[PDB]
Write a protein that binds this ligand. Structure first.
Ligand SMILES: O=C(O)c1cccc(Cl)c1
Ligand SMILES: O=C(O)c1cccc(Cl)c1
Lengths: 498, 498
């Protein structure tokens, strides 16, 4: 195997004086060799204070050079970084750190208050006391490089109840990085300038962006806060070769580029990658018109990383397996060998090989639901297209079954989202009749505007949707309940309207 | 890990009906699924005759669809293919199979005579009795897929005394394939059409060409015999995306393309890769002028695969480490930690990690010479250029040390090779004076032509060579002694002229 530490160490010997970390705002550049020296020093200093290999340390911070040093430092020591979204509720973060029996918590968020008062006896480390603007506080004797095993825990990442802690083994690093090369077409070399738009607590942000950038002897451009015109200036200024970004980032970037034209020089950007299963046709449309570089749509999971992709995509929902990947579509709630007839819908399962998580920390029942007979079960519904591609339909959990028929809310949402006057829409099934579930649309109007059930129904009737998929009922709401992050709490919403 | 078998198996599930093997001459195409079925059937039939996992089977055959099936078949069974050059002497092949305690010998070469009469009780299998033109003789019950371990032997390849048997472990396959992607820029997908110019008994021919082609869900184009104009027609006809070829192939191909112009459509060819350390500046020159695609120079060994490379190269001798690679230049005949001053010459050693051989079969002394303290020693002399690239000078064994000075015969040979009237030249050191060794040139004239020591000396004097490097003596010969393959036996030649 080749671990994160080894990938980064080998890179440092090949390109010691090439720029590793760029923070254009803070006037901060760090070479590969200089990044190593700080990783070594924070490692040693963390060790000199009683942190041992395999001890889980929480990390809760926005993107920055300092948090990159600290995360790599912990891994170099041998500790297992558990990376957590800083948008989470103080209460949630304290609770997650408690369940995880975490030894320490590196924070740069008040949230420190919550952790002491949770019971969890996790040592609160403030990030600014380890490393500040790339320069660390040093002390302690230089430290040994611990022995690392293929199945051994290496990093913990969190999912979608409370977020679950997915354990990423040492051997998963390489293929979690190299798919950026086999699928996306990144290659080794110092031309690589990678814009860090993705948060570091998401596996793409860490393995596919941060680690890939350095492991290929390139440069990682730190972005502490996303602004669409500023990001495009970075593309031009830094000579960005690739960016991996959310559908929401790309909508912003494409529109800013459209209201920029040849004001910004974007030619250096050769790779625009995104997880676009949920990307509407209209955003995809603008991405091709207004942004340069080859576009690659990618499907993946925290649990197994990349499982499908598409070069120069037409719809955002249709993709095919790449290198490392093996996939099947099986009967919903059946065994891993129950393959559907091409054309019938089912659950996407992918083989659980090198890139796979090895279980959810302290949640062995959820693990047993997800890892069966060598497969990882996505909980996503899919269908083989006659053209040999996989069409992602939606989450199994969001699926509505009305009059014995599979209806996917995401399909209805993308239609209703184009209805004039609509700012947000979530489609849900209410426990009911026609039977089983009744398709119901919850719609938020644009600021100042009225909506009516009649007008929306007329709009749906005049759209491509088939009979049974048309909502039977509409609720016009001033907002939708959306947890600590900005994703809808369907269950909670269903509970609100009934 | 991801083994050859697993790489090819996963590929078959992703692209069952895409063309895997093309033999345009024989009118033979085989899809991925069809190639699998034959690999399964020859495997089973080989098993039904008493071949067990980990038993070494020799393979001695020119390139063909049938030998690809048989090699993959043996690996699928679990047997360890030992691939041998068919150009070797009958006596040599019998002897190598004897030392290797090989259980069987798959041959398609008389050479069968030699093997029985060597003592080695290796079962002689004729290739035409396993599979002919892609259709096998089937029998026996379908067979289990054996458990494979990371350090376990998988394939045996032979080197430069008698050729040594380098044992390639299961875990070496992935990085021996994926460097074609990280260094060379191959990516996953069915556009991949790979021309099989390289012999299958060379690690590049097997891992970097055959296995890479299939593992990326592409097509391998079988070439049973190299002809420069025919090969270029294949590029055009088959839509070849990449070729990996020897310097000798590229000289032929470039000249045929120059005496073709826009007669042949070569635009589909995006990657032209070669091991060009020994490629003269003039051939490289023509490669850029007359052949399309990005040119990539690559340095590597049987023992550790790829260790250096260069995109769009200027000299053929200057390269830098890519992904997976770590390299040092150390004092000749010193410890792995004795790094030279940048500018001093030394031995190129590369780290022995995932891609590395695990030893020479039954030759533990040679192993101990080559694998020290986690490094592989190339036996190649190199120097760091002020620009941070590695300049390969020549083999340590060919090095001449005259008047206490490092002189590399390859440098002198490339100068003398341009002297009009010269068809071949080898430079050697004779045990002698000035002192230690005396630089001596052995030159073969062109058909019908005379050479003189005086005229050659005049030519050298008028060349870029420094004082001490000029040959002190010339031998004009009608030929140079060149073993079973076409490489010069320096030791033997030295012995001839003295
Ligand atoms: O969260 C995702 O969409 C994701 C996660 C891992 C890998 C990929 Cl390609 C995508
Ligand atoms: O024999 C060579 O030159 C060789 C062997 C393995 C890998 C490479 Cl890139 C080159």
């Amino acid at each position: 195997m080749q671990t994160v530490n080894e990938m980064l160490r080998r890179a440092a010997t090949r390109a010691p004086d090439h720029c590793a970390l760029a923070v254009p705002a803070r006037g901060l550049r760090l070479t590969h060799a200089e990044l190593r020296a700080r990783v070594e020093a924070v490692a040693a200093r963390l060790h000199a204070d009683g942190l041992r290999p395999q001890q889980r340390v929480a990390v809760v911070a926005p993107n920055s050079a300092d948090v990159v040093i600290a995360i790599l430092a912990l891994h170099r020591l041998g500790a297992v970084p558990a990376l957590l979204n800083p948008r989470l509720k103080s209460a949630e973060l304290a609770e997650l750190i408690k369940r995880g029996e975490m030894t320490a918590a590196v924070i740069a968020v008040q949230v420190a208050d919550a952790i002491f008062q949770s019971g969890s006896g996790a040592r609160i480390i403030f990030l600014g006391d380890l490393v500040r603007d790339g320069e660390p506080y040093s002390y302690g004797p230089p430290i040994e490089d611990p022995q690392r095993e293929p199945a051994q825990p290496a990093f913990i990442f969190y999912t979608s109840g409370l977020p679950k802690a997915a354990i990423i083994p040492q051997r998963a690093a390489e293929s979690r990085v190299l798919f950026m090369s086999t699928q996306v077409g990144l290659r080794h070399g110092r031309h690589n300038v990678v814009l860090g738009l993705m948060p570091l607590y998401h596996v793409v942000g860490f393995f596919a962006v941060l680690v890939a950038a350095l492991a290929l002897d390139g440069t990682y451009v730190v972005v502490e806060e996303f602004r669409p015109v500023d990001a495009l200036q970075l593309v031009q200024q830094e000579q960005v070769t690739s960016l991996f970004a959310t559908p929401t980032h790309l909508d912003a970037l494409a529109a800013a580029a459209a209201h920029a034209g040849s004001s910004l020089k974007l030619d250096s950007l050769r790779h625009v990658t995104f997880a676009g299963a949920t990307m509407p046709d209209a955003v995809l449309e603008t991405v091709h018109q207004h942004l340069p570089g080859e576009k690659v749509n990618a499907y993946g999971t925290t649990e197994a990383m990349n499982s499908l992709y598409m070069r120069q995509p037409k719809t955002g929902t249709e993709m095919a397996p790449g290198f490392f990947s093996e996939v099947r579509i099986v009967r919903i709630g059946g065994g891993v060998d129950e393959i559907v007839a091409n054309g019938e819908e089912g659950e996407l399962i992918v083989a659980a090989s090198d890139s796979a998580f090895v279980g959810y920390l302290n949640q062995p029942q959820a693990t047993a639901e997800k890892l069966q007979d060598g497969w990882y079960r996505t909980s996503d519904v899919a269908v083989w297209t006659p053209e040999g591609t996989v069409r992602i339909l939606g989450r199994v959990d969001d699926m509505i079954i009305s009059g014995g028929e599979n209806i996917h809310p995401s399909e209805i949402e993308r239609v209703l989202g184009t209805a004039p006057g609509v700012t947000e829409v979530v489609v849900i099934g209410l426990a009911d009749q026609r039977w089983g579930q009744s398709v119901t649309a919850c719609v938020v109007p644009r600021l100042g505007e009225t909506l009516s059930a009649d007008a929306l129904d007329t709009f749906c009737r005049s759209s491509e949707l088939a009979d049974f998929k048309r909502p039977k009922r509409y609720f016009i709401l001033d907002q939708l309940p959306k947890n600590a992050l900005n994703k809808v709490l369907r269950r909670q919403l269903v509970q609100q309207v009934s």
